[PDB]
Design a protein around this ligand. Structure first.
Ligand SMILES: CCCCCCCCCCCCCCCCCC(=O)OC[C@H](COP(=O)([O-])OCC(O)COP(=O)([O-])OC[C@@H](COC(=O)CCCCCCCCCCCCCCCCC)OC(=O)CCCCCCCCCCCCCCCCC)OC(=O)CCCCCCCCCCCCCCCCC
Ligand SMILES: CCCCCCCCCCCCCCCCCC(=O)OC[C@H](COP(=O)([O-])OCC(O)COP(=O)([O-])OC[C@@H](COC(=O)CCCCCCCCCCCCCCCCC)OC(=O)CCCCCCCCCCCCCCCCC)OC(=O)CCCCCCCCCCCCCCCCC
Ligand SMILES: CCCCCCCCCCCCCCCCC[C@@H](O)O[C@H](CO[C@H](O)CCCCCCCCCCCCCCC)COP(=O)(O)OCC[N+](C)(C)C
Ligand SMILES: CCCCCCCC/C=C/CCCCCCCC(=O)OC[C@H](COP(=O)(O)OCCN)OC(=O)CCCCCCC/C=C/CCCCCCCC
Ligand SMILES: CCCCCCCC/C=C\CCCCCCCC(=O)OC[C@H](COP(=O)(O)OCCN)OC(=O)CCCCCCC/C=C\CCCCCCCC
Ligand SMILES: CCCCCCCC/C=C\CCCCCCCC(=O)OC[C@H](COP(=O)(O)OCCN)OC(=O)CCCCCCC/C=C\CCCCCCCC
Ligand SMILES: N[C@@H](Cc1ccc(O)cc1)C(=O)O
Lengths: 128, 606, 156, 178, 98, 458
């Protein structure tokens, strides 16, 4: 009836436009109940320490520790040299260097050749 | 000893005294804002005298007072330029700051940190004066970055709010993109002219090449929020209303334009950079005036109006009329600050509401604010013999009668129609009709601070154009002869914009409902420019800086090649060497092999 | 007081390993899904949906209201990219790939029109401006020892 | 913000939320009051036209079509209340909010001013210390063996009890703290 | 629909406690127990700084060459010079297009 | 210049003879007095250096470095006494002894007239740093950090030693004055290329050069606060000082041997600035910042112009002060919350306003706000690079945009937003911490007032 909205990576699909939430099953209801139970258990565990009058300091969060560890220390032990890894490493670690080397070498060779011929307009060029 | 120099220096010097007193027993009392406002008013009154001297005899100066450091052949000194631009801009900025500070005494009365707010406002003013009066590029850069940092601090005034911090960082990002061009210009000038001061740069560049001027244009586009780097100015409305009235409408955002006005002798000799400036200004003014006509936040409308007027200033610079652009800066400051102050008065009256759809009939409920806003809108549209007329009308006539890009001319005319259109939108939705605000009415504008500030800016918006135009020497040749229809072009297009906007606004009273067109969606969502440009490049940059720079290279491959390979090789060789069973049979056989090899390889050759 | 078992591990292969990983990350087994087992180094960490923090419900009582996070729940790999001071993936009124077409079309049209207006400029029906002293030869750079070719203007 | 959420929304809840959203966006389109009232009455008639549909599948199909129409015809710039999550004053006063425990670190000269206030604070702290263990015991009793299933908390039931986990709700800083 | 009796009761109890806490934030009449000319602005903020600046410019800055450079005054036909006393002649017998 | 060396050697037994509860007071007082004495070295000439004896000399390049070292010792002492309160008296005296020995080695390194004596002292600085890191670091990774700190250095410096002795067999001297006066060009042969690499790689790994920098995040994150201060502020500048000394004998080979290092420096400056945008640990962000600034310094030294040398000197001094201040600022929060995760403690401006002001000023100096000496050095280097090639303004320009971003990002993450609700142990700032921040920041602006003292011999 109306023009259709299509989602993208940086502009996602709205919940009210999602087909999965319009055709539901008792299995889906059970899964939602389990999700809410997990969230409620975590919320109770946090709130018990949050309201503790004898608690002074920082309530340690295992999820934050897991996130930082995964982002920092768990990366190399889970690395394998593969065609994708090797190709991406070679590209993004070597290509820019040679690209910039070619650019700068060409520019400086042109400038040097111009200077040898004596046509660069270096008047008032005292500081370098 | 010709009090010109002493008075020009004292005007800037006395502004720093409350900064030095910010650690005394006046910053802790409730008398600090009045003290700062009185200091600014005294500074304005003192600065009025060098302006009179210049208007009498055209007196100009440069003062190189302190020698900072000297390179081998480059000497860096604290020097101030006191030409027409400085001595004209300083009183205007001081007058506007005085009015806005008196307004802020009433607007920010409930802020627990009002003293810090005034201290912040004064620091911005000092940095802007440093920018304006600078005689060398390093001092100008000091003022540049100072006003940038002060704007960053004032945009994120409510630092517990996420959107304000995001807007402040956005302003910093766009200004840094401009600062790249600023630094390019500085490096080119030092390596080619051996100077950073204006006099030697003017002497040694009779036909300026493209690179320094393009760097200056990039810096100006960053500072004045031109089309490529425009979105940060409307988002800067996250700050308090006085910050919007002072920094982001009338004083700081013209700085980029001011930069191009400073280097007009070099720009006068380069046609390509002039054409680029003209086209940039034309597209900026058109796009911003087109975005402004559908906005519902009043601060957003006024910000887009400011951006469109900056685009018009860039157009004026592009047609080789820098003095007209400076005059337009001076004219626009008055009524733009007044319009922002009237918007702030409305917002404070209606319990901090900024949507025009919830402002009803304020024509009778808010008489003085209505009068001031009407006068400001009429001045903004170039109504004859008001302040905006004496600059905008001449700008339109000069654009008409020049050898110029035709598309830029067309966009300038369309933009000056859209100006009247969005002025009509503001007036119609905010002041006419029936109330649409909540029923508990707290409308009250009876406060002497607000009334006096707005009245001062209103007298300015009525008479400053005539007074300033009749008191400056003529630096341009007047367009004496023109066809009658081209003499009336600005008035005609303004009238058509008025009528069309009035018709399209009157149609809203009908009992008809229709879904919006794609053109309306393009206008309201700002050409989708912030939707795409603030999501795609940012996502790709951050994702690449995690996935590739941090993980693929620094955490994996750089580790893999040098240290991990060395550790692996040494460990394997250690295992190979040290793992022997301890049986004398095996390594005595090894001894026999060694003896035979040493007898053949080394001993047979002597 | 976090044990070694709690810390993230390698990519799980057996279903028992997947169940243990889901238990470690406070997730249901059918909801837990790791990154594909390439050599990139993700290991055990779950692949959460790519929505930013701006999309989360602002009317819920989050443990961290500004971050819109709850204590103990699994954190997205790219949380610092999605902190809502930053990249936003929220649904838009107009489709992506339609905003892009309109923006690119507007920009390209303006560029082409500026080029056209440059090669079809606008001007008044007048001749060049006339300057008295040989086009002000001495004023625009001097050189008073060359006797330039005279520039003469006549009355009309 | 105050109520504990459920595991899912029901069909009636979704219909009512769509009705409120549609009316708000229509008001955003219809700026004037009389026009908004007219079109809001039309929208209410359109909503209650299909109120008595006994077929649930058809009801959800109608809801789906209505949500698609809403997404097509939504106002790109709808009116937001200034303190609502999208408003201009959403988190304006969060920088002025200071937690109460900071008062424990005031220098005794600072506490020499406001003696009565700090005496009342000591009384409140004594009450919290005396109530904590009973709150914990009540939560232990009332919780099902497989952990809690919702985020709803029980009230006080005994003679002089206090509702468990009350301190950080009762001692909120303020809506306009400074 | 609506609150369950448990939710209602918890809301009433929390509301009573919160109202007590808000009442306790009020200040008694003594709570801030504190422990123990006209035109002088124009003198200390204008006159003294201008004295210092004028002294610094007159006797220190202008003691070195090219520190305060002014562009020369405009000279028009019919003017007389203050130093030399020389007068400047008039302008070549205007054609008088009256 | 024994009038500076002998008082530090006297600090040693003064510390070891002090009463158990007066070690910090005595060490701080006499360290400050030694800094005041060393202030007299700033009186330099325009033609040659101050040649005190056959063994020690002072130039316009080494005098600000010596002043920075002697000024950093009392700040390190002030920053260390908080987390060492539970330590025994003997171990506290040993820690102070390590700091004093490091200062002595640095002072003698910056003034040695011969290159082998310079090498010996510049390697001797390794032992106290390694001991400090591996004995007083907090986490288990410190051990690995120590190893990364050691071998990365030595694998660079062992070839240099060989080259040095080889040079002494060829020219007969390693005295720097003789080396400068009797300079001869380097021809284009494989032997000369490898001599150039042997003379350059140790200083390259000290800066560190991008690609050889992996030791730095580990060592600067795992170290105690004084270790991080001295690693960022002074020990990174050994590479730059040594490179500016050694380049006098490498011409005209440098003219083309600098290309790979220039490309690495520029691209890796962009890369490390980008890495700073996605960092969860606050100390690692500051370390990668140091890497970017040192890449700028490497470019300046490699292009070999007077403006680039002045910019390099100014940038080294400014970065030392700024990075030390940033490490101290991060350490205050770490001592409060015992975690280095940046997003753990937020909205600290509401709880600690003056510390927030210190954070703002430090981050402003990090992004080189004019007219700070950070900006002066950066601008001089950028101008020299522009003269070297007009295209460099692209990469440099990009760097200027990224730096500010991450700098402000850091500030916005820690000071703004709302405070974390469950963190209730944030005590008011002590006088010691505020004094530490002030003693970092005030010299920066004072040096801005008189920039020719940090601009070097050029
Ligand atoms: C005499 C000599 C001089 C001759 C001059 C020319 C002669 C003609 C005279 C009149 C000319 C213009 C008349 C008015 C225009 C119509 C106004 C209007 O709103 O119509 C309603 C209608 C939409 O109304 P709506 O959606 O129902 O409103 C929503 C509600 O009302 C919500 O209500 P609301 O409260 O939110 O308010 C909505 C708001 C705004 O509502 C909107 O959003 C609509 C925007 C329309 C106004 C924009 C005008 C500026 C044009 C700049 C374009 C530059 C080039 C861009 C190129 C794009 C490239 C893709 O309304 C307003 O505020 C008023 C709008 C402006 C009125 C003032 C007009 C002055 C400017 C133009 C006239 C200039 C006069 C002097 C000329 C001087 C020159 C010498 O607009 C249009 O559809 C027409 C707009 C024109 C766009 C054409 C662009 C092309 C589109 C298709 C592209 C083709 C693609 C082909 C393939 C390509 C492949 C690559
Ligand atoms: C430019 C005006 C000149 C005034 C003349 C006299 C100035 C004397 C200043 C002496 C040095 C400042 C001391 C540094 C430590 C900060 C003090 C502190 O800890 O706060 C406690 C103290 C107690 O107040 P509180 O009630 O407890 O509130 C504390 C709360 O934490 C919250 O406190 P808050 O919210 O009030 O914020 C504290 C404040 C303090 O934080 C700061 O940012 C101050 C540090 C400066 C920034 C450092 C990085 C920038 C690199 C530039 C280096 C410039 C140094 C020049 C040589 C200095 C000689 C030592 O930050 C700000 O207010 C905003 C900062 C934005 C500054 C933007 C300007 C950029 C440069 C523009 C021009 C600079 C060159 C001038 C000449 C140019 C050519 C004519 O705070 C104050 O009293 C207010 C501080 C005054 C602000 C000074 C800003 C302008 C001065 C810039 C350099 C001075 C140049 C003087 C030469 C003559 C011109
Ligand atoms: C992770 C970061 C580590 C630090 C980075 C250190 C950078 C070191 C890079 C060395 C720069 C250049 C070294 C030598 C200069 C020229 C090299 C050569 O490629 O150029 C041509 C040399 O020609 C050929 O290329 C021959 C060399 C080929 C064999 C070299 C092996 C290089 C392959 C890459 C291995 C990776 C090395 C680094 C390991 C980590 C020039 O032709 P030619 O004029 O005749 O030689 C000049 C010398 N002459 C005059 C004495 C004759
Ligand atoms: C010169 C070389 C570089 C030129 C610039 C190229 C593009 C640079 C890309 C920058 C990537 C930085 C990634 C990290 C930034 C921090 C994250 C961030 O900024 O958050 C996004 C934040 C949130 O978006 P909002 O719309 O404000 O929503 C908030 C309300 N809910 O928005 C932003 O700040 C995004 C700003 C990025 C701008 C990038 C596009 C600019 C491109 C300029 C090109 C035009 C040149 C102009 C030429 C003028 C004529 C001479
Ligand atoms: C307080 C009020 C004091 C009232 C009594 C004093 C009245 C006047 C005293 C005159 C003293 C004599 C005097 O000033 O002589 C000038 C004397 C010597 O000349 P130099 O130029 O410095 O020599 C080159 C070495 N740099 O200079 C001075 O010492 C006075 C300096 C005052 C400068 C004004 C303040 C500006 C400095 C702010 C910081 C700027 C940072 C860098 C900016 C870069 C700009 C490109
Ligand atoms: C020809 C010979 C060339 C000799 C080059 C030797 C380089 C000197 C470093 C030697 C490293 C030895 C490390 C090793 O082999 O063991 C692997 C080791 C096992 O740990 P262990 O402590 O032994 O066990 C304790 C728990 N049971 O694995 C590790 O994790 C090592 C961690 C520290 C390694 C640090 C190495 C850093 C190297 C940086 C570059 C320098 C390389 C030197 C050559 C440079 C190229 C010219
Ligand atoms: N190397 C420079 C250092 C310097 C810089 C600035 C000065 O003002 C003085 C000296 C010489 O000449």
């Amino acid at each position: 009836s109306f023009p259709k909205y299509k989602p993208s990576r940086l502009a996602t699909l709205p919940a009210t436009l999602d087909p999965a939430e319009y055709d539901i099953s008792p299995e889906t209801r059970k899964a939602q109940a389990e999700r809410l139970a997990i969230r409620s258990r975590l919320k109770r565990e946090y709130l018990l320490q949050y309201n503790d009058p004898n608690r002074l300091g920082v309530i340690e969060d295992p999820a934050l520790i897991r996130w930082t560890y995964a982002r920092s220390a768990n990366i190399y032990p889970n690395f394998r040299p593969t065609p994708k890894t090797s190709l991406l490493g070679a590209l993004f670690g070597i290509g820019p260097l040679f690209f910039w080397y070619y650019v700068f070498k060409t520019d400086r060779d042109k400038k040097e050749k111009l200077i040898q011929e004596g046509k660069l307009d270096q008047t008032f060029n005292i500081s370098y | 000893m010709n009090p010109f120099a002493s008075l020009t220096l004292t005007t800037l010097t006395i502004l720093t005294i409350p900064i030095m007193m910010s650690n005394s027993n006046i910053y802790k009392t409730n008398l600090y804002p009045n003290y700062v406002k009185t200091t600014v008013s005294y500074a304005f009154t003192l600065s009025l005298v060098p302006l009179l001297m210049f208007m009498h005899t055209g007196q100009e100066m440069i003062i190189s007072n302190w020698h900072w450091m000297t390179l081998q052949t480059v000497e860096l000194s604290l020097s101030f330029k006191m030409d027409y631009f400085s001595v004209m801009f300083i009183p205007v900025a001081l007058f506007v700051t005085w009015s806005i500070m008196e307004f802020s005494m009433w607007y920010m009365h409930s802020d627990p940190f009002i003293n810090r707010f005034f201290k912040y406002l004064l620091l911005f003013l000092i940095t802007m004066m440093i920018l304006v009066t600078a005689n060398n590029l390093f001092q100008l850069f000091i003022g540049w970055e100072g006003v940038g940092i002060m704007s960053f601090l004032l945009i994120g005034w409510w630092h517990g709010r996420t959107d304000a911090n995001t807007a402040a960082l956005q302003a910093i990002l766009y200004n840094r993109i401009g600062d790249i061009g600023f630094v390019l210009s500085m490096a080119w000038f030092l390596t080619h002219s051996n100077a950073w001061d204006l006099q030697q740069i003017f002497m040694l560049n009779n036909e300026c090449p493209n690179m320094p001027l393009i760097g200056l244009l990039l810096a100006a586009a960053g500072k004045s929020a031109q089309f490529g780097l425009h979105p940060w100015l409307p988002s800067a409305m996250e700050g308090p209303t006085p910050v919007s009235a002072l920094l982001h409408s009338s004083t700081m955002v013209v700085a980029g334009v001011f930069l191009l006005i400073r280097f007009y002798p070099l720009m006068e000799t380069n046609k390509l950079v002039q054409t680029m400036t003209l086209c940039l200004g034309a597209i900026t003014t058109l796009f911003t005036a087109l975005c402004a006509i559908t906005q519902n936040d009043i601060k957003k409308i006024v910000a887009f109006s400011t951006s469109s007027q900056l685009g018009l200033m860039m157009v004026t610079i592009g047609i080789n009329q820098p003095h007209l652009a400076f005059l337009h800066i001076c004219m626009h400051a008055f009524f733009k600050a007044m319009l922002f102050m009237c918007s702030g008065s409305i917002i404070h009256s209606l319990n901090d509401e900024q949507d025009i759809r919830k402002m009803g009939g304020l024509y009778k409920a808010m008489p003085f604010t209505t009068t001031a806003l009407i006068i400001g809108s009429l001045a903004l549209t170039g109504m004859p013999y008001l302040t905006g007329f004496y600059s905008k009308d001449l700008i339109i006539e000069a654009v008409n009668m020049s050898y110029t890009n035709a598309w830029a001319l067309l966009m300038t005319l369309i933009a000056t129609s859209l100006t009247a259109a969005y002025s009509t939108r503001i007036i119609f939705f905010a002041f006419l009709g029936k109330p649409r605000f909540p029923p508990l009415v707290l409308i009250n504008e009876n406060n002497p601070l607000l009334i006096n500030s707005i009245k001062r800016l209103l007298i300015g918006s009525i008479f400053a154009g005539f007074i300033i135009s009749n008191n400056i020497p003529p630096m341009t040749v007047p367009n004496t002869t023109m066809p009658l229809y081209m003499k009336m072009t600005a008035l005609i297009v303004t009238i058509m914009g008025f009528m069309l906007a009035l018709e399209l606004n009157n149609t809203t009273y009908y009992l008809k409902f229709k879904y919006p067109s794609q053109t309306y969606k393009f206008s309201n969502m700002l050409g989708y420019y912030p939707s795409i440009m603030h999501r795609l490049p940012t996502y790709h940059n951050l994702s690449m800086s995690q996935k590739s720079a941090s993980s693929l290279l620094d955490l994996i491959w750089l580790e893999t090649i040098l240290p991990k390979t060395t550790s692996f090789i040494q460990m394997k060789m250690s295992i190979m060497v040290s793992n022997q069973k301890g049986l004398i049979k095996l390594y005595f056989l090894s001894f026999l092999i060694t003896i035979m090899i040493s007898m053949t390889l080394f001993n047979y050759h002597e | 007081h976090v044990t070694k078992d709690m810390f993230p591990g390698p990519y799980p292969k057996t279903p028992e390993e997947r169940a243990a990983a889901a238990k470690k990350y406070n997730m249901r087994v059918e909801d837990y899904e790791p990154y594909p087992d390439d050599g990139m180094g993700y290991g055990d960490y779950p692949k959460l949906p790519d929505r930013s923090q701006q999309e989360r419900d602002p009317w819920y009582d989050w443990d961290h209201p500004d971050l819109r996070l709850n204590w103990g729940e699994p954190i997205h790999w790219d949380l610092d990219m999605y902190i809502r001071n930053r990249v936003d993936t929220s649904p838009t009124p107009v489709s992506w790939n339609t905003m892009c077409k309109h923006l690119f079309g507007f920009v390209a049209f303006m560029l082409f029109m500026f080029w056209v207006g440059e090669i079809y400029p606008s001007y008044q029906p007048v001749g060049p401006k006339q300057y008295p002293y040989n086009d002000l030869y001495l004023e625009r750079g001097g050189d008073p020892t060359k006797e330039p070719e005279p520039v003469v203007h006549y009355e009309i | 913000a105050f109520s504990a959420p459920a595991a899912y929304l029901t069909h009636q809840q979704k219909v009512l939320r769509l009705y409120k959203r549609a009316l708000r966006h229509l008001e955003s389109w219809c700026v004037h009051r009389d026009k908004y009232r007219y079109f809001a009455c039309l929208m209410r008639a359109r909503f209650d036209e299909h109120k008595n549909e006994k077929d649930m599948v058809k009801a959800t199909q109608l809801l789906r079509q209505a949500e698609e129409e809403f997404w097509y015809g939504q106002h790109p710039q709808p009116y937001i209340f200034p303190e609502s999550p999208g408003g201009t004053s959403y988190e304006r006063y969060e920088c002025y909010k200071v937690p109460e425990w900071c008062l424990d670190d005031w220098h005794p000269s600072e506490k020499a001013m406001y003696p009565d206030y700090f005496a009342k604070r000591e009384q409140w702290k004594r009450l919290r210390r005396e109530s904590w263990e009973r709150e914990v015991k009540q939560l232990q009793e009332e919780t099902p063996p497989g952990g809690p299933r919702t985020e709803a908390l029980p009230p006080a039931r005994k003679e002089g009890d206090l509702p468990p986990l009350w301190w950080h709700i009762v001692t909120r800083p303020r809506e306009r703290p400074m | 629909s609506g609150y369950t009796p448990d939710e209602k009761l918890r809301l009433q109890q929390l509301r009573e406690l919160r109202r007590r806490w808000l009442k306790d934030q009020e200040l008694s009449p003594r709570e801030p127990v504190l422990p123990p000319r006209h035109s002088i602005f124009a003198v200390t903020h204008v006159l003294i700084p201008v004295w210092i600046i004028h002294y610094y410019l007159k006797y220190h800055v202008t003691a070195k060459p090219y520190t305060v450079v002014e562009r020369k005054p405009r000279i028009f036909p019919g003017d007389t010079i203050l130093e030399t006393g020389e007068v400047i002649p008039l302008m070549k017998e205007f054609p008088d297009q009256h | 210049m024994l009038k500076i060396i002998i008082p530090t050697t006297m600090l040693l037994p003064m510390t070891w003879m002090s009463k158990h509860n007066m070690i910090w007071i005595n060490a701080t007082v006499h360290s400050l007095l030694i800094s005041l004495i060393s202030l007299s070295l700033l009186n330099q000439l325009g033609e040659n250096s101050l040649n005190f004896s056959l063994t020690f000399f002072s130039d316009s390049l080494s005098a600000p470095l010596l002043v920075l070292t002697t000024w950093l010792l009392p700040l390190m002492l002030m920053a260390s006494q908080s987390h060492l309160s539970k330590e025994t008296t003997t171990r506290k005296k040993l820690y102070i002894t390590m700091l004093i020995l490091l200062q002595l080695f640095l002072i003698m390194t910056f003034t040695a007239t011969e290159l082998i004596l310079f090498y010996i002292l510049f390697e001797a600085t390794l032992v106290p740093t390694l001991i400090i890191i591996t004995r007083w670091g907090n986490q288990t990774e410190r051990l690995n950090a120590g190893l990364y700190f050691l071998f990365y250095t030595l694998a660079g410096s062992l070839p240099l030693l060989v080259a040095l002795v080889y040079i002494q067999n060829t020219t007969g001297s390693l005295n720097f004055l003789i080396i400068h006066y009797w300079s001869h060009p380097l021809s284009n042969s494989w032997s000369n290329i490898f001599m150039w690499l042997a003379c350059i790689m140790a200083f390259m790994v000290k800066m560190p050069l991008y690609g050889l920098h992996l030791w730095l995040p580990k060592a600067h994150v795992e170290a105690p606060i004084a270790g991080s201060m001295v690693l960022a502020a002074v020990l990174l500048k050994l590479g730059g000082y040594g490179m500016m000394r050694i380049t006098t004998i490498l011409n005209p080979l440098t003219n083309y041997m600098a290309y790979p290092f220039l490309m690495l420096s520029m691209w890796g400056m962009i890369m490390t600035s980008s890495i700073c945008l996605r960092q969860t640990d606050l100390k690692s962000l500051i370390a990668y910042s140091s890497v970017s600034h040192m890449a700028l310094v490497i470019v300046a030294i490699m292009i070999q112009t007077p403006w680039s040398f002045m910019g390099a000197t100014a940038l080294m001094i400014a970065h030392g002060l700024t990075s030390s201040m940033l490490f101290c600022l991060a350490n205050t929060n770490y001592e409060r919350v015992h975690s280095r995760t940046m997003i753990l403690a937020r909205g600290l401006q509401t709880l600690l306003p003056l510390m927030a002001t210190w954070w703002l000023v430090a981050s402003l100096t990090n992004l080189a706000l004019p007219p700070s000496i950070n900006l002066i050095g950066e601008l001089f280097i950028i101008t020299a690079s522009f003269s070297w090639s007009n295209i460099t303004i692209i990469l440099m320009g990009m760097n200027m945009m990224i730096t500010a971003l991450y700098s402000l990002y850091m500030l916005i993450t820690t000071q703004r937003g709302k405070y974390t609700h469950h963190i209730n142990n944030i005590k008011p700032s002590f006088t010691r911490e505020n004094a530490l921040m002030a003693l970092h920041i005030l010299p920066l602006l004072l040096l801005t007032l008189n920039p020719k003292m940090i601009l070097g011999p050029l």
